[PDB]
Design an enzyme around this catalytic site. Structure first.
Site, mmCIF file in Angstrom:
data_model
loop_
_atom_site.group_PDB
_atom_site.id
_atom_site.type_symbol
_atom_site.label_atom_id
_atom_site.label_comp_id
_atom_site.label_asym_id
_atom_site.label_seq_id
_atom_site.Cartn_x
_atom_site.Cartn_y
_atom_site.Cartn_z
ATOM 1 N N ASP B 43 0.806 -1.220 0.000
ATOM 2 C CA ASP B 43 0.000 0.000 0.000
ATOM 3 C C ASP B 43 0.843 1.276 0.000
ATOM 4 O OD1 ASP B 43 0.454 -1.401 2.416
ATOM 5 O OD2 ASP B 43 -0.673 0.132 3.515
HETATM 6 C C1 LIG Z 1 4.229 13.989 17.184
HETATM 7 C C2 LIG Z 1 3.065 13.799 16.216
HETATM 8 C C3 LIG Z 1 1.821 14.662 16.508
HETATM 9 C C4 LIG Z 1 0.469 13.927 16.341
HETATM 10 C C5 LIG Z 1 -0.156 14.003 14.920
HETATM 11 C C6 LIG Z 1 -1.700 13.827 14.840
HETATM 12 C C7 LIG Z 1 -2.246 13.230 13.506
HETATM 13 C C8 LIG Z 1 -3.629 12.507 13.588
HETATM 14 C C9 LIG Z 1 -3.593 10.983 13.943
HETATM 15 C C10 LIG Z 1 -4.603 10.092 13.159
HETATM 16 C C11 LIG Z 1 -4.556 10.200 11.612
HETATM 17 C C12 LIG Z 1 -5.908 10.434 10.922
HETATM 18 O O1 LIG Z 1 -6.803 11.018 11.474
HETATM 19 S S1 LIG Z 1 -6.149 9.795 9.203
HETATM 20 C C13 LIG Z 1 -6.939 11.040 8.029
HETATM 21 C C14 LIG Z 1 -8.485 10.977 8.021
HETATM 22 N N1 LIG Z 1 -9.118 10.593 6.742
HETATM 23 C C15 LIG Z 1 -8.790 9.472 5.968
HETATM 24 O O2 LIG Z 1 -7.896 8.722 6.360
HETATM 25 C C16 LIG Z 1 -9.555 9.221 4.665
HETATM 26 C C17 LIG Z 1 -9.330 7.851 3.963
HETATM 27 N N2 LIG Z 1 -7.986 7.736 3.381
HETATM 28 C C18 LIG Z 1 -7.722 7.025 2.198
HETATM 29 O O3 LIG Z 1 -8.694 6.499 1.669
HETATM 30 C C19 LIG Z 1 -6.272 6.936 1.608
HETATM 31 O O4 LIG Z 1 -6.307 5.841 0.759
HETATM 32 C C20 LIG Z 1 -5.147 6.716 2.665
HETATM 33 C C21 LIG Z 1 -5.736 6.324 4.011
HETATM 34 C C22 LIG Z 1 -4.384 8.020 2.779
HETATM 35 C C23 LIG Z 1 -4.127 5.553 2.220
HETATM 36 O O5 LIG Z 1 -3.846 5.624 0.924
HETATM 37 P P1 LIG Z 1 -2.784 4.358 0.105
HETATM 38 O O6 LIG Z 1 -2.924 3.229 1.096
HETATM 39 O O7 LIG Z 1 -3.508 4.216 -1.205
HETATM 40 O O8 LIG Z 1 -1.419 5.005 0.049
#
Ligand SMILES: CCCCCCCCCCCC(=O)SCCNC(=O)CCNC(=O)[C@H](O)C(C)(C)COP(=O)(O)O
Ligand SMILES: CCCCCCCCCCCCCCCCCC(=O)OC[C@H](COP(=O)([O-])OCC(O)COP(=O)([O-])OC[C@@H](COC(=O)CCCCCCCCCCCCCCCCC)OC(=O)CCCCCCCCCCCCCCCCC)OC(=O)CCCCCCCCCCCCCCCCC
Ligand SMILES: CCCCCCCCCCCCCCCCCC(=O)OC[C@H](COP(=O)([O-])OCC(O)COP(=O)([O-])OC[C@@H](COC(=O)CCCCCCCCCCCCCCCCC)OC(=O)CCCCCCCCCCCCCCCCC)OC(=O)CCCCCCCCCCCCCCCCC
Ligand SMILES: CCCCCCCCCCCCCCCCC[C@@H](O)O[C@H](CO[C@H](O)CCCCCCCCCCCCCCC)COP(=O)(O)OCC[N+](C)(C)C
Ligand SMILES: CCCCCCCCCCCCCCCCC[C@@H](O)O[C@H](CO[C@H](O)CCCCCCCCCCCCCCC)COP(=O)(O)OCC[N+](C)(C)C
Ligand SMILES: CCCCCCCC/C=C\CCCCCCCC(=O)O[C@H](COC(=O)CCCCCCC/C=C/CCCCCCCC)COP(=O)(O)OCCN
Lengths: 175, 88, 178, 56, 459, 52, 69
Positions: B43
């Site tokens: 992925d």
């Molecule tokens: C020290 C660090 C500080 C903390 C940072 C905080 C960050 C937030 C933590 C949680 C992360 C989120 O919310 S996650 C963001 C919220 N929305 C989504 O995930 C929508 C669905 N994504 C997809 O469909 C894509 O395919 C994808 C998943 C990109 C993969 O793609 P490949 O597989 O085709 O590469």
């Protein structure tokens, strides 16, 4: 050295303590001093004495210039340009000489401060006192003339000061 | 003196070493020209970790626009050679 | 820095860049490798939790909240690679990079040394001179009448052709010029 | 052969002689300001038994 | 004194009778020899001036100015012969004639005994300068610049003439020796106030004083290289020399009439120094640094003390040399890239290593690094100003901080960073340019060992 | 530069130093003040009539 | 392996520097030798009192031979 007059640039008689070693360890300063004398001072004195023999073969003299005394600005008439010129030149020469007198006194003061070490505040009272008087007289004579000074402005300053002194003396006599 | 004159074979060896140390990809199957998606079924998120591992291995940062494209070990080797001016 | 930029980044690109940035800052916070591995696996799980969300409004909102989380939780002193834009050796060797056209101004006594190098340079200059009109022609034919939409350049499509606008890319000074 | 040098290098003596002439014109000027020669109250002096003027 | 004037006059027929390809050689050699002859005037007395004749005299204030004036002509000829290559023979000779006439007028101006003759020569210096600017300048603005140069000066000096012939009608003479010996105080009256203004504003415009300094960023920028060199090095110092000469008649009126000018100078120092921080034109930055430096000379002359006069003389000489060198340094880059924008050509230290050293030394002298005479003059003026009022240290201190900022900025923009990629016509430095820089900088450093030669009549 | 370095002392600095040394020596032996407050003698000055 | 180092032409700066050095030394070395020879073999004058009935020349008021000349 006979270069300068010792009465105008005096110094104390230079009391130096005799070396009185207590330990049996060798003194590194003595060994280094002997090395310096044998390797540095002796060639320097040899070269200097050669230079002096070369100098003694040619002897010539230069003379300090003597200047006559001419009438000052007080004796000059209002618009007599030639006497004003001579008086002003003599006044400028006297101003330079006074500057150098203050310079000599300041050199005495500095040399005393360095020589006396931690006891300068007490052992340099005479030099500080001489400088205070010379500085007061120089300030009375030439202070505040500004750029474009002259003998006429100095005379006007002195006359104003004497008028102030006369008024102050008349004020005291009335008590 | 400083670091030795790194060569093309060394870059390829280190890239394949790092890839073979990845649990997701088996050592026997992996090849220099293997695509990370078609060949290894990896992925996009997985790919990012490989790029970061290559950065940690060679000690330099690959920009995100440049990084996404690299899908084969040969591509990574060519990119590193272009950056470090490696001609053999 | 070698690929042409696009008009915008897609959602997938934004979330991937966020993943890499958050992992790097997490590694800055977690100095030790085992602790970094632990919390990086936790981070990957947190990213995978919404891997296949199909509501683009929900996905955008989740990405935005993730950005707001990162900005508050970022390391104020993140680790930077030494030659990266914020690093301690970023542009250290730029004072040593000298353009090659300077070699044209060398005194003939200077060029008397290195005769082979300057013969090779003359061959390179002749090659650059001989292929310029073909490259210009290729660019004009390939590009649209309005102009080029993107900064991507075409390769050489004939045999004895060089890719257009190649001289300054090829004759880069070096990364360690001295 | 002397002309091959002189005829194209004589402009090289304009400024030198212009200097020399200048010095001459200074000396003549000094001859018009002698009204106080050996007459100032600061430098008035008895002449040496052979000299005629204290300065020129 | 004719032993300098007459050889200078012979430079005209020598230039006009020279071969088409020998004018530069002859002019350079003989102007250098005239500088050698001019060095004899530095032997000054401690009491009065060198009174050559009824017409010409030399003092410890005018002798260094004369030496700088004669020394500047060979440097101007060296700096001019590159961009005048394609010129016709007769126009080259006309340009050299303009420079020779300018030198002749300046030499007589600095040594005139009578103030009306001084005024006539000090005004005659306008014609060759204006012709140089408006005939050999490069851009269309050079015409307007000329007008600004012409009318700012004259509007100041026309009252001065009216004052001078007025003074001679009441005191009987304009001879400077008589003026100094027969000096009388100025009363506190409206007529005396306007006579004071008429005697001062002409010199203030030449300095120039902040507020009437607009002509300078135009004239210096649009002028050819020799024009800007002579404008900065010598023509600005005419105001300082004239103010120093004419201040004797002014007292005691100067104590209260100097306040507006002291405020204008002490604030415009900050204003122009800060203007240098945001200047896209390099030659314009160099021009504004001159206004910032001459504000200090104005302050020193207005406060009227021996330390201030010494400092003003030293600063005038040091600024002449440094500003001339900076203008030449900018011209070297202009003749390469044909633009005066400072950020157009960058990273030049990589491509021109020794000219970068020249740039560094010029910038160091501009910010008055000790023990350069720039610093000597600046520090003397600052000490005298502190005596005049302690609060001045705040303004003076601020100016020093700003001057270092725009100097090194000027150095960092043009020499450091990375060279712009497109430019590819940056040829190696010529021996002519390197020698032109050396002949600017070596006398400056050598004057550190004998500063009394440039400290004026108050030493 | 060599010519300027060896210029004769027409500024009379060494002369002034010598004269100052002479007067300091003379005054100190005498016990007179080293420097005088008034440059011009009082006897040759004719102040106005009276202080009022 | 040894590589070519791309540099700006250093010939002209070096030529200018050696030209300036030569043309300064060409007169400086003779001047230094003359000054030290004069110093060693014709020293400074010695301050003396003016003999009675003698008027010194104006150059006899300076002590260094070069300054007197
Ligand atoms: C020290 C660090 C500080 C903390 C940072 C905080 C960050 C937030 C933590 C949680 C992360 C989120 O919310 S996650 C963001 C919220 N929305 C989504 O995930 C929508 C669905 N994504 C997809 O469909 C894509 O395919 C994808 C998943 C990109 C993969 O793609 P490949 O597989 O085709 O590469
Ligand atoms: C204390 C030092 C002792 C010195 C011993 C005697 C030395 C005499 C030298 C006199 C100066 C020469 C004239 C300057 C132009 C040089 C021409 C040139 O291009 O040379 C290239 C030549 C060949 O090199 P290259 O490989 O071709 O160069 C390629 C690039 O250009 C690359 O070149 P680069 O990157 O090498 O650049 C050249 C180099 C050097 O270039 C220069 O900077 C020259 C100018 C120096 C700064 C002057 C402007 C600042 C204002 C102060 C002015 C002071 C003047 C003092 C009197 C000078 C009289 C001549 O740059 C620097 O090193 C930094 C300069 C900043 C100096 C900071 C210190 C300033 C204060 C120092 C104290 C001053 C008073 C001392 C006495 C105090 C009480 C004891 O290089 C040299 O030969 C060396 C240059 C000389 C460096 C001297 C630095 C100290 C100077 C102190 C002043 C003189 C004092 C003398 C009496 C004893 C003290
Ligand atoms: C490279 C290209 C780049 C250019 C760079 C930019 C430059 C541009 C061009 C500028 C042109 C320059 C123009 C300036 C002209 C000014 C000349 C002048 O006025 O001369 C004045 C001055 C001479 O003064 P004076 O008034 O004529 O003489 C008064 C006395 O009557 C005389 O005293 P005396 O009669 O008792 O004896 C003295 C005599 C005799 O001396 C001796 O013989 C005594 C030596 C004693 C040695 C003791 C041991 C040796 C023998 C022992 C063994 C023999 C016997 C046993 C044998 C067995 C062996 C074991 O020696 C002399 O006369 C000195 C010679 C003067 C040379 C001047 C150099 C400048 C010439 C101008 C042109 C320069 C162009 C460059 C070419 C330079 C070529 C070199 O010349 C000096 O150099 C004096 C300096 C001495 C100071 C020593 C060092 C002090 C250290 C303090 C500072 C420490 C702080 C850290 C900083 C260190 C930085 C160095
Ligand atoms: C931008 C660069 C321009 C150049 C700057 C030049 C600055 C020129 C300023 C001149 C300095 C002072 C001028 C006259 C001295 C005092 C002026 C006045 O303000 O003070 C009072 C003067 O009294 C009244 O105020 C009269 C003046 C009022 C009318 C004049 C208008 C001034 C407004 C400012 C105009 C802007 C000047 C620049 C024009 C372009 C003093 O009180 P008083 O005791 O009674 O008078 C004593 C003077 N005596 C001895 C001659 C009799
Ligand atoms: C490239 C490599 C660079 C480094 C290598 C170089 C090697 C070292 C060379 C540098 C020497 C360092 C200097 C050290 C100081 C010694 C020189 C000093 O002794 O000379 C001074 C003398 O310097 C001169 O006085 C100053 C020269 C005057 C400069 C005039 C420039 C020439 C005219 C050019 C026109 C420019 C216009 C100027 C407008 C005013 C001392 O003055 P003074 O205390 O008295 O002498 C006492 C004895 N006297 C009186 C009997 C002579
Ligand atoms: C680049 C801009 C520079 C501007 C400079 C212009 C300002 C010059 C200063 C005023 C010039 C005229 C002064 C006249 C010369 C003085 C001679 C004199 O002493 O005459 C006065 C007379 O003074 C005057 O008449 C001058 C009055 C003003 C006339 C012209 C007005 C000009 C404008 C005045 C204000 C501007 C000055 C400052 C502006 C600064 C520049 C912005 C007294 O003589 P008597 O009549 O005999 O008196 C004694 C016996 N009764």
């Amino acid at each position: 050295p006979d270069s300068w007059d010792k009465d105008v640039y005096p110094e104390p008689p230079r009391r130096t303590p005799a070396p009185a070693p207590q330990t049996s360890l060798p003194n590194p300063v003595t060994y280094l001093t002997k090395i310096f004398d044998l390797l540095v001072d002796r060639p320097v004195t040899l070269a200097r004495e050669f230079i002096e023999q070369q100098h003694a073969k040619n002897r010539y003299y230069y003379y300090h210039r003597e200047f006559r005394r001419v009438p000052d600005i007080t004796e000059c008439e209002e618009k007599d340009i030639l006497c004003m010129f001579e008086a002003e030149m003599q006044w400028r020469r006297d101003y330079k000489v006074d500057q150098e007198i203050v310079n000599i006194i300041q050199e005495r003061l500095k040399a005393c401060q360095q020589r006396e070490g931690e006891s300068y505040r007490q052992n340099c009272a005479k030099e500080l006192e001489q400088f205070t008087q010379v500085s007061k007289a120089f300030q009375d004579r030439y202070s505040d003339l500004g750029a474009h000074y002259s003998a006429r402005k100095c005379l006007a300053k002195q006359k104003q000061r004497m008028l102030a002194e006369r008024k102050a003396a008349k004020e005291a006599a009335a008590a | 003196s400083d670091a030795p004159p790194l060569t093309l074979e060394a870059i390829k060896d280190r890239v394949l070493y790092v890839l073979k140390l990845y649990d997701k990809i088996d050592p026997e199957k992996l090849s220099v020209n293997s695509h990370f998606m078609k060949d290894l079924g990896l992925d996009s998120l997985d790919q990012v970790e490989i790029i970061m591992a290559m950065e940690d291995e060679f000690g330099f940062e690959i920009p995100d626009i440049d990084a996404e494209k690299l899908m084969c070990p040969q591509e990574i080797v060519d990119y590193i050679a272009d950056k470090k001016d490696v001609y053999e | 820095a070698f690929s042409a930029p696009a008009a915008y980044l897609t959602h997938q690109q934004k979330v991937l860049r966020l993943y890499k940035r958050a992992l790097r800052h997490l590694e800055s916070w977690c100095v030790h490798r085992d602790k970094y591995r632990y919390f990086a696996c936790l981070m990957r799980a947190r990213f995978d939790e919404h891997k296949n969300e199909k509501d683009m409004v929900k996905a955008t909102q989740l990405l935005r909240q993730a950005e707001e989380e990162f900005w508050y939780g970022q390391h104020p002193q993140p680790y930077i690679f030494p030659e990266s834009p914020g690093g301690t050796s970023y542009e250290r060797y730029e004072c040593y990079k000298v353009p090659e056209w300077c070699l044209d101004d060398w005194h003939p006594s200077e060029k008397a040394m290195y005769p082979d190098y300057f013969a090779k340079r003359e061959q390179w200059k002749r090659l650059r001179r001989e292929s310029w009109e073909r490259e210009v022609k290729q660019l004009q034919e390939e590009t649209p009448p309005g102009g080029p939409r993107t900064e991507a350049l075409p390769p050489a499509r004939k045999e004895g052709d060089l890719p257009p606008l190649w001289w300054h890319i090829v004759t880069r000074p070096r990364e360690r010029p001295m | 052969n002397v002309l091959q040098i002189v005829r194209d290098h004589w402009v090289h003596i304009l400024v030198p002689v212009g200097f020399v002439f200048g010095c001459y014109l200074d000396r003549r000027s000094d001859e018009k300001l002698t009204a106080f020669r050996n007459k100032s109250l600061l430098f008035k002096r008895e002449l040496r038994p052979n000299e005629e003027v204290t300065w020129k | 004194m004719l032993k300098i004037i007459i050889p200078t006059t012979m430079l005209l027929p020598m230039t006009w009778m020279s071969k088409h390809n020998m004018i530069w050689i002859n002019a350079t050699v003989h102007s250098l020899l005239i500088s050698l002859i001019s060095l004899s005037l530095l032997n000054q007395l401690g009491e009065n001036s060198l009174n050559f004749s009824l017409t010409f005299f030399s003092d410890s204030l005018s002798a260094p100015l004369l030496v700088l004036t004669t020394w500047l002509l060979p440097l101007m000829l060296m700096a001019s012969q590159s961009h005048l290559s394609k010129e016709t023979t007769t126009r080259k000779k006309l340009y050299i004639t303009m420079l020779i006439l300018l030198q002749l007028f300046l030499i007589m101006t600095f040594t005139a005994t009578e103030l009306i003759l001084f005024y006539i020569l000090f005004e005659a210096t306008l014609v060759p300068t204006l012709i140089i600017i408006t005939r050999w300048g490069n851009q269309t603005e050079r015409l307007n610049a000329g007008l600004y140069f012409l009318f700012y000066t004259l509007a100041g000096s026309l009252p001065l003439l009216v004052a001078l012939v007025y003074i001679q009608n009441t005191t009987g003479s304009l001879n400077f020796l008589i003026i100094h010996y027969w000096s009388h105080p100025l009363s506190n009256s409206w007529s005396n106030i306007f006579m004071w203004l008429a005697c001062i504003m002409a010199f203030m415009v030449k300095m120039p004083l902040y507020g009437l300094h607009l002509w300078l960023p135009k004239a210096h920028v649009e002028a050819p290289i020799a024009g800007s060199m002579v404008l900065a090095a010598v023509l600005l110092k005419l105001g300082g020399y004239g103010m120093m000469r004419i201040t004797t008649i002014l007292n005691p009126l100067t104590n209260y009439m100097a306040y507006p000018f002291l405020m204008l100078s002490m604030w415009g120092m900050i204003m122009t120094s800060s203007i240098c921080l945001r200047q896209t034109d390099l030659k314009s930055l160099i021009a504004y640094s001159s206004v910032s430096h001459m504000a200090l000379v104005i302050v020193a002359i207005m406060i009227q003390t021996p330390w201030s006069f010494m400092g003003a003389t030293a600063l005038m000489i040091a600024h002449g040399l440094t500003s001339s060198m900076l203008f030449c340094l900018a011209n070297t880059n202009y003749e390469r890239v044909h633009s005066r924008t400072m950020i157009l050509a960058r990273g030049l230290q990589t491509l021109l290593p020794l000219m970068a050293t020249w740039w560094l030394v010029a910038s160091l002298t501009n910010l008055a690094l000790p023990p350069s005479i720039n610093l000597i003059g600046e520090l003397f003026i600052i000490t005298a100003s502190f005596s005049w009022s302690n609060i001045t240290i705040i303004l003076m201190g601020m100016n020093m901080m700003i001057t270092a900022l725009y100097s090194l900025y000027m150095l960092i923009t043009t020499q450091r960073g990375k060279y712009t990629h497109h430019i590819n016509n940056i040829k190696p430095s010529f021996t002519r340019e390197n020698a032109l820089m050396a002949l600017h900088i070596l006398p400056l450093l050598l004057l550190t060992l004998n500063p009394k030669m440039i400290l004026g009549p108050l030493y | 530069s060599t010519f300027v370095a060896y210029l004769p002392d027409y500024r009379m600095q060494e002369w002034a130093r010598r004269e100052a040394e002479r007067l300091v020596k003379y005054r100190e032996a005498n016990g007179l003040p080293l420097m005088e407050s008034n440059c011009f003698d009082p006897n040759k000055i004719q102040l106005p009539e009276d202080e009022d | 392996k040894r590589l070519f180092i791309i540099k700006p032409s250093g010939f002209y700066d070096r030529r200018f520097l050696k030209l300036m050095r030569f043309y300064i030394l060409l007169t400086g070395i003779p001047v230094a030798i003359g000054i030290t020879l004069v110093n060693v073999f014709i020293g400074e004058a010695e301050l003396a009192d003016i003999p009675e009935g003698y008027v010194p020349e104006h150059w006899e008021y300076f002590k260094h031979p070069i300054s007197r000349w």
